[PDB]
Each structure stands twice: as structure tokens, then as C-alpha cells.
Amino acid sequence: KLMTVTKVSLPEGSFKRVKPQYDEIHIPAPSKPVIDYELKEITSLPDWCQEAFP
Amino acid sequence: GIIITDQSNVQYYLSVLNQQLPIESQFVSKLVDNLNAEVVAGNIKCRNDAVNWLAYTYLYVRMLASPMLYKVPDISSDGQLKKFRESLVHSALCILKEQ
């Protein structure tokens, strides 16, 4: 059901529902990361170190 | 991620859910025993020493940050808790002595 401008909007948060029994709220997923990096590969390690993640 | 609860306190809970309330030291209680242990270990020979030791604790840091809530008198006189710490130590050592 409908939603109103309410406390702790953010305003990345974006859901509200209702019933005459209980006032039911949802929230979307937390944001996905901005990428300004290299996902660090395993081969970049020294020799012995690559058995960190066998 | 869901919670079932009363609608009144949800408002309070919402803030918490945003990870807002920080880590705040509970060393008030466990101060004493820890202090005793330190003493036993054989190095805290004076309240100055105790105060020095306390500085390395997170309680001290917390006090420095946001004092007033933690039973604190005043920042201008103490500066870096160099009376408050002493007071704490003194409190510890009377009770400890009694036991």
C-alpha cells in the first residue's frame, strides 16, 4: 500500500506498506560497491603464499 | 532481514539497524578486577602507575571522546583525565582494600 515522507528516509530507502492489523515496512538492499580498484588475484603473491587459498 | 516487534520502539530500532549506536566501554565494572590482577602481576606500585595503565585502555579513550555521560566532572581542570582517572583508581583501591 501507499508510502509517506517519514523519519530516516536517507533517501536511498524506498518502501512502506500497511494493514489495519500491523503497519508493515520493507527496505531495499544496501548499495553495491563503486569500483576504483583491482580485484587482487592470487598469482601476484610469492610462491609459498599461493597456498593461502588452495 | 526481518524483525517482529511492537510498533512504538521500532522507531528506536530503525536507527540501530542503520548501525548507528557505537561501541561504548563497559570498563566501569570490570575495572576493579583487572586492576587487582595488574597489581598482583607486580608493577602497579602507585596510583600514578594505575592512571598510566588506564590510559592504554579504551575506557579512557571513550571518556576523552564524550565524557559527560561517563560520570565525568569537567574537562578544563583535568584536561586529559589526570584527576578523573585518579578518582577511579582511588575508588577501586578502597573497595579492593576492604576486600
d(CA B60, CA B63): 5
**Cα nearest neighbour of B11 on chain A:** A7
CA angle B40, B44, B49 (to 5 degrees): 160
What's at A43, amino acid-wise? T
d(CA B18, CA B15): 5
Asked if A2 contacts A16 with a C-beta cutoff of 8 angstroms, the reply is: yes
d(CA B11, CA B3): 13
| Interface A:B, Cβ pairs < 8 A | 8
Asked if B32 contacts B92 with a C-beta cutoff of 8 angstroms, the reply is: yes
CB atoms within 10 A of CB B1: 6
d(CA A27, CA B17): 11
Asked if A7 contacts B11 with a C-beta cutoff of 8 angstroms, the reply is: yes
| Closest chain B C-alpha to A32 CA, distance in angstroms | 16
B15 interaction partners in chain A (CB closer than 8 Å) = 8
CB atoms within 10 A of CB B84: 23
Architecture of domain B24-99: Orthogonal Bundle (1.10)
